[PDB]
């Protein structure tokens, strides 16, 4: 981790650690004792908060969807990506290739909707969240045969309990997920660009298992991703521009930095 | 089959794994190995400070 | 002494009198694929000295106002030699590179270039609900150029090229985490980077994925006084390293 | 069964917690690893890498490459200033979007030494000397060369070897300093002056540039994760 | 009692979970086992068994036994195609309802080699030769015999021994391929041509058939369970 | 009376049985023995590849 | 990795730490060391009772 | 090289085996044996022409 400062006295020598050539593409290994007289300091500081498995291993909200126990929008569909929401996305894009296991956690809430229904009296709601791996049947309605879940992972959750959670393995067909792809999936080099199937990891469906009330209730499910067991390769400059789309790297040109008055001024504007 | 490891301090704790999948285990927090020499000093020739970088 | 260098690959030899060392990747030198990392079960083709040798690309003038240039690596050598004739007959291949950029000028000239090899440099589009076409990203040994002003948004399949965002939406001054050297005209006249194969798969098709992009970007413009040479070229030379190919089929 | 009792914090979702949870896909074997070049295991690996500093950034300079360039020229006398900016990465306009500075808007605290490198990009007939100074805080910025040579400084002579390093020592009352602006954990001021004029012969440009780089030393550390102020959204993408 | 704390995922029903639960009938002794022939312990046992492939399946052929039959005949010249279908079991019309293909609509990923066998079912006076080819993807299907002999191929000569195996190597960028259609994990194309004409004497039929079989090799594996798209219902039966 | 067994990896876990019936135990996930030779090669005579199947 | 310590009485208890941070541990209740001699008697010369404080 | 000591440049010194005529472009000539010559201190460079012949001797 952090290294200890070593004491140094006066010099007058043919050594020149301060002078260097930065054209070589090498970062100089100069320490403070080289350029000045220092005392010996014992350092007890650590670099344990800046591990990759600390930086990326906190739950982050990626998406939220709504669905109702009446009318249209009886269920919610979402294709799992960590690219809908800015904050998690930016952190993963300090790297080109990442490999991790997910832990999904769901915060499901319900809100009574305005109506003129007399004598509402909800029963407790039970919700079903169904993970469907790539390919295979997709529910086209609440009350299809796809919600049987004979071989699709699924959880059921009654209100007023702890959030559900489940672990997902590393599901890539590649040896790492890629956050950037500089190519086309077609051999003609036509169609969509930057689209790849290394990051597929199914679709998520959510519904009510009962309409408890005679009146309308609308639920909101929020999905949290927590990377764990992380490994990362090839670091990249942070994103400077705001994101526009979830499938593209497209951007509006942004200035390098914010301005200031002069090149000698000691304040920001 | 318990592991006993040291805690982060300025003691020890006990952990048992309960599941048959190794993707169910808690996150690895205490791995502190590092090597900045891939990204700093990627040069073929060995640079010695206190000697010219270019002769 | 430390400034003289010679690199021999196949027929080719490069010699420089001013050299800033050689940068090697992420401290990994090119190697052949192991049998404990391989997936494909056929015997590789390894042409050796018919693929792994220096190829010069077209030169491009450095002017007092020039914004920069880029070349996408497997598709800038795709029409050249038997390197280009092994990647259209095979479905797979993997290779590293040695990139050597030359640019010589007098001791009365000044300027500075940044030479970077950027893994998977995916580049934005001027119009925000389209992606670029393959005729705006890929040259073929001709360099594509950046712009100094934003590309206007039409109904475009154009690339958003601005030097200061590097066409990727990042600060251009932070491209120094990628393997790099500077050509500063008062010091050195050449730069050498040796890239290893970087991908998340052991081999990949090379006619629809570009896994590296070379960019040469002026940070300090070219300047000289009247009476000096007004034409200063920048030549790029690229050699494959440990090329393999697998999955022999028909041409296309 | 076994008599148990629940404590405060049961049935909560803490976002920083580490607990075990069953897999939704049991007995799933993951694809083998391959060695990919350039594995990262710490972010202080990649904060120790030089990154071009946009010292200039005055009006319309941030929308060009002129931000990174620092003017120097042949002028009458010497002891005129070249630049000045305050030490406070992850706050200052100059340092907030550098590679060092963006691994430091995810943290509340920072400690250790920082090294600036300078690279002279004139012609090979140009020559000069500079005074690269750093003043601890408590007396404001130096406004003369003679005020600035009472702090830490290095005199840089340009010849073969076209770079020089000003390493900024850690001189602080506290063990850590805030990333965000506070006057209790003020950093000091970094200034540059002509020690000697830029001297050129005929037919060589008398205007030259300097480029600046910044990286952390090996005694550097960061602490206490937080959201960065530099990414936003109004709706899902 | 013992202080405990509940974590997220308590009081949930995950359908993939393995936990112990009390029996509703305690001390119930089950009937003895007997050895019954043909115990199955893995489904890759029964994916390594040959299964007739319905190569033909053009209009009204699927409602007959003509689906399984592949026409070959005596014709002028040679180098004409006999069949072509793409490599992609568990998607393709040809392979989705084969025995291999239906242990592969329960899985998302697949890897390994596949072996096609062909059985000539002409008369014993008929003779001929075929070119059984496989082309990796990246150049489209071969449209001539000379385009198809640049890929993997076997020349099959018919005599005693009336079958020949074209083993399809694993040649893929990735370690696994998707079961479902994706162009990133394209499989290639399998084609057949006349290397030599079918030659018969008088009083023997000049029209013959070939039957095709498919099975997995011993390096084959599948991964990631999912519901099959091939069974449906509108109400309970 | 705990069993300690290896997890599925690209460590170990602990399990105790709590009930007196062996139909209450968790599912057996880690049994990987197989024998495809009943369904492939059920022939009485031994087939050798690299020799005619029929003489 | 259990600690066994004595209880406050006019027996023993068992404690296991469950977390990887040492700021998650229960409060230290049983530390009874003390030294009032910093705040009482801070004088340089040693005072002896049964002798004049000032000669 | 017999320029002044301020002159600098680079050259491609190529040799092509026979069977395709003389190269007529720089890109045709870099497919043969070649050396890139950089002028600095050391004002000479050697292009050694290998023996590549079907026969052991040539007329
Ligand atoms: O609270 C958070 O966890 C949460 C809140 C905001 C957020 N990101 S945001 O870009 O600010 C954002 C802000 C609002 C909405 N949004 C709505 O508020 C809403 C209401 C009704 C239908 C659809 C939507 C919907 O897309 C979506 C995203 C992420 C998470
Ligand atoms: O959700 C699932 O778990 C679930 C949903 C559908 C399902 N199979 S189905 O064939 O699609 C099916 C679809 C509908 C009904 N069904 C009704 O919806 C219903 C309403 C009222 C009375 C009787 C019934 C009844 O038989 C039964 C079966 C199985 C389980
Ligand atoms: C090694 O694992 C044996 C050490 C003693 C184990 C105590 C176990 C604690 C209670 C059971 C946890 C079981 C999780 C499935
Ligand atoms: C062997 O079983 C003894 C090993 C230690 C057992 C720890 C038991 C954990 C708590 C009791 C589980 C009892 C289930 C009825
Ligand atoms: C030393 O710690 C081993 C002594 C026996 C441990 C019994 C553990 C009790 C149950 C597990 C507590 C685990 C907390 C993460």
Question: Can you describe what's shown?
Answer:
This is part of a larger assembly, with 1 copy of chain A (269 residues), 3 copies of chain B (55 residues), 1 copy of chain C (252 residues) and 3 copies of chain D. In chain A, 4% of the residues lie in helices and 28% in strands. By secondary structure, chain A is mainly β. Chain A has one domain. Chain A starts with 18 loop residues before the first strand and ends in a 34-residue tail after the last strand. In chain B, 25% of the residues are buried. Chain B has a two-stranded antiparallel ribbon. Chain B has no helices and 2 strands. Chain C has 252 residues and is mainly beta. Chain C has one domain. Chain C is built from no helices and 13 strands. In chain C, strands 3, 4, 5, 7, 11 and 13 form a 6-stranded mixed beta sheet that branches. By secondary structure, chain D is mainly beta. Chain D has one domain. Chain D contains 1 helix and 14 strands, in the order ββββββββαββββββ. In chain D, the strands form 3 sheets. In chain D, strands 3, 4, 7, 10 and 13 form a 5-stranded antiparallel beta sheet that branches. Classes of the chains: A mainly beta (269), B mainly beta (55), C mainly beta (252), D mainly beta (237). Chains in contact: A-B, A-C, A-D, A-E, B-C, B-D, B-F, B-G, C-D, C-E, C-H, D-E, D-F, E-F. Chains A and D meet through strand 1, helix 1, helix 2, strand 4 and strand 7 of A and strand 2, strand 5, strand 7, strand 10 and strand 14 of D. The complex binds the ligand O=C(O)c1ccc(NS(=O)(=O)c2ccc(N3C(=O)c4ccccc4C3=O)cc2)cc1 (2 copies) and myristic acid (MYR) (3 copies). One ligand FHK sits at the interface of chains A and D. Chains D, E: This is Capsid protein VP3.
Number of strands of chain A: 11
Tally of structural domains of chain A: 1
Q: How many angstroms separate the termini of chain D?
A: 51 Å
Helix content of chain A: under 10%
For the biggest sheet of chain D, the summary is: 5 strands, antiparallel
Please indicate the percent range of residues of chain A in DSSP E strands (runs of 2 or more): 25-35%
Main structural class of chain D = mainly beta
Span between N and C termini of chain A?
A: 37 Å
Which distinct ligands sit in these coordinates?
Answer: the ligand O=C(O)c1ccc(NS(=O)(=O)c2ccc(N3C(=O)c4ccccc4C3=O)cc2)cc1, myristic acid
H/E topology pattern of chain A: EHEEHEEEEEEEE
Name the assembly state. part of a larger assembly
Shape of chain A: elongated
What would you report as the Rg of chain A, rounded to the nearest angstrom?
27 Å
The radius of gyration over CA of chain D amounts to: 24 Å
Structure annotation, total helices of chain A: 2
Number of helices of chain D: 1
Subcellular location (chain H): Virion; Host cytoplasm
Protein name (chain H): Capsid protein VP3
Function (chain H): Forms an icosahedral capsid of pseudo T=3 symmetry with capsid proteins VP2 and VP3. The capsid is 300 Angstroms in diameter, composed of 60 copies of each capsid protein and enclosing the viral positive strand RNA genome.
Organism (chain H): Coxsackievirus B3 (strain Nancy)
């Amino acid at each position: 981790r952090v290294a200890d400062t070593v004491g140094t006295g006066p010099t007058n020598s043919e050594a020149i650690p301060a002078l260097t050539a930065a054209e070589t593409g090498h970062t100089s290994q100069v320490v403070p004792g080289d350029t000045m007289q220092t005392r010996h300091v014992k350092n007890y500081h650590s670099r344990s908060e800046s591990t990759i498995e600390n930086f990326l291993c906190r739950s982050a909200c990626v998406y939220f969807t709504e669905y109702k126990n009446s009318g249209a929008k009886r269920y919610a569909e979402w294709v799992l990506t960590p690219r809908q929401a800015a904050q998690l996305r930016r952190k993963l894009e300090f790297f080109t290739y990442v490999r991790f296991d997910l832990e999904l956690t769901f915060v499901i809430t319900s809100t009574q909707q305005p109506s003129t229904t007399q004598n509402q009296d909800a029963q407790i709601l039970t919700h079903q969240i169904m993970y469907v791996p790539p390919g295979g049947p997709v529910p086209d309605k609440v009350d299809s045969y796809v919600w049987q879940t004979s071989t699709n992972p699924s959880v059921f959750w009654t209100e007023g309990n702890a959030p559900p959670r489940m672990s997902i393995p590393f599901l890539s067909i590649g040896n790492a997920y890629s956050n950037f792809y500089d190519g086309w999936s077609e051999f003609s080099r036509n169609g969509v660009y930057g689209i790849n199937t290394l990051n597929n990891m199914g679709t998520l469906y959510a519904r009510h298992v009962n309409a408890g009330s005679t009146g309308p209730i609308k639920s909101t499910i929020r999905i949290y991703f927590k990377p764990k067991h992380v490994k990362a390769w090839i670091p990249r400059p942070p994103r400077l521009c705001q994101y526009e789309k979830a499938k593209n790297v497209n951007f509006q040109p942004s200035g390098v930095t914010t301005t200031r008055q002069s090149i000698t001024t000691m304040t920001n504007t | 089959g318990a592991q006993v490891s040291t805690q982060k301090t300025g003691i020890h704790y006990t952990n048992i794994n309960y599941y048959k999948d190794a993707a169910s285990n808690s996150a690895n927090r205490q791995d502190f190995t590092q090597d900045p020499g891939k990204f700093t000093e990627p040069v073929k020739d060995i640079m010695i400070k206190s000697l010219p970088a270019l002769n | 002494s430390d400034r003289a260098r010679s690199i021999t690959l196949g027929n080719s030899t490069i010699t420089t009198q001013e050299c800033a060392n050689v940068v090697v990747g992420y401290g990994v030198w090119p190697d052949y694929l192991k049998d404990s990392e391989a997936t494909a079960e056929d015997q590789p083709t390894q042409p050796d000295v018919a693929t792994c040798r220096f190829y010069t690309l077209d030169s491009v003038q450095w002017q007092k106002t020039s914004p920069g240039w880029w070349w996408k690596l497997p598709d800038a050598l795709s029409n050249l030699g038997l390197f280009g004739q092994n990647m259209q007959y095979h479905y797979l291949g993997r290779t590293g590179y040695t990139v050597h950029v030359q640019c010589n000028a007098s001791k009365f000239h000044q300027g500075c270039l940044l030479v970077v090899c950027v893994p998977e440099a995916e580049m934005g589009c001027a119009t925000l609900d389209n992606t670029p076409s393959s005729a705006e990203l890929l040259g073929g040994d001709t360099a594509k150029e950046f712009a100094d002003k934003p590309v206007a948004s039409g109904s475009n399949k154009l690339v958003q090229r601005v030097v200061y965002n590097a066409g990727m939406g990042v600060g251009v001054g932070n491209l120094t985490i990628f393997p790099h050297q500077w050509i500063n005209l008062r010091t050195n006249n050449s730069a050498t980077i040796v890239m290893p194969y970087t991908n998340s798969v052991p081999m990949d098709n090379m006619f629809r994925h570009n896994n590296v992009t070379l960019m040469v970007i002026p940070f300090v413009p070219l300047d000289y006084c009247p009476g000096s040479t007004t034409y200063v070229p920048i030549t790029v030379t690229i050699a494959p390293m440990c090329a393999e190919y697998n999955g022999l089929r028909l041409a296309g | 069964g076994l008599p148990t009792m629940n404590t405060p914090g049961s049935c909560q979702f803490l976002t920083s917690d580490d607990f075990q949870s069953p897999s939704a896909m049991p007995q799933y074997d993951v694809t083998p690893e391959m060695r990919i070049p350039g594995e990262v295991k710490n972010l202080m690996e990649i904060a120790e890498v030089d990154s071009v500093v946009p010292v200039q950034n005055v009006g319309e300079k941030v929308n060009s490459m002129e931000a990174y360039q620092i003017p120097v020229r042949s002028n009458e006398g010497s002891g005129t200033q070249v630049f000045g900016f305050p030490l406070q990465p992850g706050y200052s306009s100059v340092f907030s979007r550098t590679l060092l500075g963006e691994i430091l808007n995810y943290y509340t605290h920072w400690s250790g030494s920082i090294k600036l490198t300078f690279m002279f990009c004139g012609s090979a007939m140009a020559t000069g000397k500079f005074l690269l100074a750093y003043s601890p805080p408590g007396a404001g910025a130096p406004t003369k060369r003679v005020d600035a040579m009472l702090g830490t400084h290095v005199i840089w002579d340009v010849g073969l070897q076209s770079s020089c390093v000003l390493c900024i020592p850690w001189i602080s009352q506290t063990h850590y300093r805030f990333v965000a602006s506070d006057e209790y954990t003020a950093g000091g001021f970094i200034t540059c002056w002509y020690q000697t004029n830029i001297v050129v012969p005929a037919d060589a440009q008398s205007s030259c540039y300097i480029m600046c780089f910044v990286s952390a030393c090996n005694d550097f550390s960061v602490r206490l994760l937080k959201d960065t102020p530099f990414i936003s959204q109004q709706n899902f993408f």
